[PDB]
Each structure stands twice: as C-alpha cells, then as structure tokens.
C-alpha cells in the first residue's frame, strides 16, 4: 500500500471492478473473495491489481506493439479497447463481428498474426480464443466469474459487464504499459481521463 497503489485500488473499487455475476466457473474459485447474501460474487481486488501489472509486463515484452491484438465483442469495450489500442499502438478488432478464420485463414481480409492476444469477455469473444488455440498464440483475458478459462494464459479478474469496469481496467493497463515503456514516469499522474474509455450512449 503505497500512495500509488492506494490510488490504484481506490480507482478499481470506484469503477466497481470487483462485482461479479452469480455463477462461479470453479476455475475462478481462487480469484473470488466473498459470496454475498444477495448472491453477488465479490472478487479479491489484490489479485486484479497484480494481474493487471503482470499483463502489462507481458505486453511490454513484445518488441513491436502491433503484434499485440485487442479483441472485443460487446459495445462497452468497443470504445474502451479502441482507445486502448490507440494509446498502446496495437491492433483493434473494431467490428464486433469477428470473422471465423481471422487467425487461421491466411487468405482472409481481416487476417492477423499477433504475438499476444487480449480479450474482453472470454465467453463472448470465445471464437477468437479458439482460433488462437490453433496458432500457438497466448492470451490475456478480462474475466468475470462466469467466464471459461480454457486456453486462457493470463486471467485478470474483472467485471466485464460494465463500461466503468472494463474501461478503467483497459485504462490502468495502458497507463502501466506506458510506465514500463518509459513513455511515462512512475511517480507522475496521467492526464488522460478514464472517462474517455467509457461508452457513450
């Protein structure tokens, strides 16, 4: 608990990143702290923080950022993740329609060959993960309690339901990646509001 870390957990809490649906894929058993009277499943936030940083370290690791690929289906993380790709200089799946064959078929128009893949809802984005499975491509996923971890290498426990949550997760990851890349000081605050990544109605 530095002031930095306290700011991190405060941001995470405020964004309500720790609220999950009621199903537990048992694969998630380890990431979930509390099970409420109202059935709400509550995530340990420390795990979230840790995993965000780990992820950032995986992304810093790929030499050339365009070999990292963010994939999102839902409407919330469209905005957030396109902004993410924006600051992170990586590739975005914009069209919510992921074309079967995108990773597998060298003949497709959307054809990509990332070194690392990042998905917003393993459950929604599943086809992407399945394709990554055919290519030897590792995956960082944003993961709710209901989400399958099959073929997922880095789990960041989140609430991938809300805009607030998803957006500030992609945000925090981006900021930490910036830091690791020396595009930003470790001590310095980032002038980009989280509010950008929110999905406007």
């Amino acid at each position: 608990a530095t002031q930095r870390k306290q700011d991190d957990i405060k941001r995470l809490l405020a964004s309500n990143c720790h609220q999950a649906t009621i199903n537990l894929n048992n694969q998630m058993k380890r990431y979930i702290s509390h099970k409420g009277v109202n059935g709400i499943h509550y995530i340990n936030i420390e795990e979230t923080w840790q995993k965000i940083k780990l992820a950032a370290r995986v992304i810093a690791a790929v030499q050339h950022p365009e070999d990292v690929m963010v994939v999102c289906s839902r409407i919330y993380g469209q905005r957030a993740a396109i902004k993410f790709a924006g600051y992170t200089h990586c590739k975005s799946t914009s069209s919510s329609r992921w074309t079967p064959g995108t990773l597998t078929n060298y003949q497709t128009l959307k054809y990509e060959e990332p070194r690392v893949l990042i998905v917003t809802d393993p459950r929604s984005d599943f086809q992407a993960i399945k394709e990554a499975s055919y290519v030897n491509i590792p995956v960082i996923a944003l993961c709710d309690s209901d989400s399958p971890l099959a073929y997922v290498d880095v789990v960041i426990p989140c609430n991938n339901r809300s805009t607030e949550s998803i957006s500030m997760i992609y945000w925090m990851i981006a900021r930490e990646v910036k830091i690791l890349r020396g595009e930003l000081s470790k001590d310095e605050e980032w002038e980009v509001m989280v509010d950008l990544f929110y999905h406007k109605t």
Partner: protein, 97 residues
C-alpha cells in the same frame, strides 16, 4: 515439499549421446515448464509467454523470462494457475510495492 522439482532442473538436458559422446538428436524440444511434457513440432496450441523484467523506476530492462506451456495444460485451463506459480518459484510474482 519441493525437492524433486528443483533437482529436476539442476542439470542440463541432452539429446541422444553415443559412446563417442556426439549429440545425435536432430533438435532438442522445448519441454513445458509446468507439466514437463515435450513440445511437439505439430503442437497447434503450445505457447511461449515472454514476461518483462522491471527496474525500480518501472523501467523494462529488455530482460525477459520465457515460460513455456504445453497444449494439454492451456486446454485444461490450468494455464492461468501454472504461470502464476512458475512466476513464484522464479521470484517474479506477486508484484512488489
């Protein structure tokens, strides 16, 4: 109770060696860092994750730990666990603050 796992990595891997002490083995496969299985030519799903090293200034050192995982492990959804623990034993996780 870690002892066997450590001793396992203690000495280097060797392909077939005849009495003239040549290496006969065409290539030395990577083995998974969790299950310790062999990494196929043909493995569709085997994966090598590189993770960056961090100086106290937040700086990447350009230094990388590579963690290899094998098809059966990712597929069973053990990956998200395996990796974490592999990072423990290498002293890189959890992340300090």
């Amino acid at each position: 109770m870690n002892s066997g796992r450590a001793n396992q990595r203690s000495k280097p891997m060797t392909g077939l060696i005849n009495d003239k002490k040549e290496k006969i083995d065409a290539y030395l496969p990577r083995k998974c860092d969790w299950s310790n299985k062999l990494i196929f030519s043909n493995d569709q799903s085997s994966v090598q994750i590189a993770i960056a090293e961090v100086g106290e200034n937040g700086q990447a050192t350009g230094s990388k730990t590579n963690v290899v995982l094998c098809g059966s492990v990712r597929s069973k959804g053990e990956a998200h666990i395996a990796l974490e623990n592999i990072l423990r034993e290498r002293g890189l996780y959890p992340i300090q603050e």
